[PDB]
C-alpha cells in the first residue's frame with residue numbers, strides 16, 4: 001500500500017471516546033464529513049477499505065454494520081472469526097496491510113482509511129509510509145476515557161489548505177470545530 005489515511009474527531013484534551021462511544025452527542029455535519037471522506041473513492045469499480053479495532057466495530061449500532069460501501073476490516077488478537085457483517089478479520093495492522101495487497105483485494109480497493117481506536121492509529125502512525133491524517137478539532141472539552149496518540153509534529157506537517165476541506169471554523173449545535181489535515185511524507 002502506497003500511503004495510509006487516518007480520520008478522527010478529537011476534543012480539547014485529545015479525547016476520542018467515553019464508555020464505548022463518542023464523548024459528545026451527535027454532530028450531524030461532522031458525521032457526514034467522516035462518511036463522505038471514507039466512502040469516496042476516485043476510481044470507478046473500486047471501494048475504499050476501512051480498518052478498525054474491536055471496540056470501535058462493536059461501537060457501531062448493529063443494524064448499521066458494516067459501514068456501507070466500504071470494505072470493513074476489524075483487527076483483534078482474540079476472535080477466531082470475523083464478527084458478523086465485517087468483511088475481514090486480521091491479527092495485526094501488518095496482516096491487514098498484507099491482505100490488502102493480495103490479488104483478490106488489490107484490484108477492488110482504492111483508499112485505505114484507519115478509523116481507530118488508539119492502538120490502531122498508533123500502529124498506523126509508526127509505519128514509515130506516506131500518511132495523511134484528517135483530524136477534526138472540536139473546540140470544547142468533554143469527559144473522555146480514551147485518547148488519541150501523540151502526533152509527531154516533526155513528521156506530520158499541518159497543511160494550510162486541502163481540496164474539499166472547509167477552511168473556516170465550523171459551528172453546529174452551539175459547538176465550534178475545525179478540520180485539519182496533516183501529512184507525513186516518506
Ligand SMILES: NC(=O)c1ccc[n+]([C@@H]2O[C@H](COP(=O)([O-])OP(=O)(O)OC[C@H]3O[C@@H](n4cnc5c(N)ncnc54)[C@H](OP(=O)(O)O)[C@@H]3O)[C@@H](O)[C@H]2O)c1
Pocket residue numbers: 007008009010015016017018019020021022052053054055056057059075076077078079090091092093115116117118119120123146
Ligand atoms: N472520536 C473518534 O474519531 C473515534 C474513532 C474511533 C473510535 N472512537 C471511540 O474509541 C473507543 C474505541 O477505541 P479503543 O481504542 O478503546 O478500541 P479499539 O482500538 O477500537 O479496539 C481494541 C481492540 O482491538 C484489537 N486491536 C486494537 N489494535 C490492534 C492491533 N494493532 N492488532 C490487533 N488487534 C488490535 C484488540 O482486540 P482483542 O482484545 O480481541 O485482541 C484490542 O483489544 C469507543 O469509545 C469509540 O467510540 C472514537
Ligand SMILES: C[C@H](O)[C@H](O)C1=Nc2c(nc(N)[nH]c2=O)NC1
Pocket residue numbers: 007008009022030031033034056059060115116136
Ligand atoms: C466509525 C466510528 O463511528 C468511529 O467512532 C469514528 N467516528 C468518527 C471518525 N472520524 C470523524 N471525523 N468523526 C467521527 O465521528 N472516525 C471514526
Ligand SMILES: [Ca+2]
Pocket residue numbers: 078
Ligand atoms: Ca482483549
Ligand SMILES: [Hg+2]
Pocket residue numbers: 011012013014015023140141142143144
Ligand atoms: Hg475532551
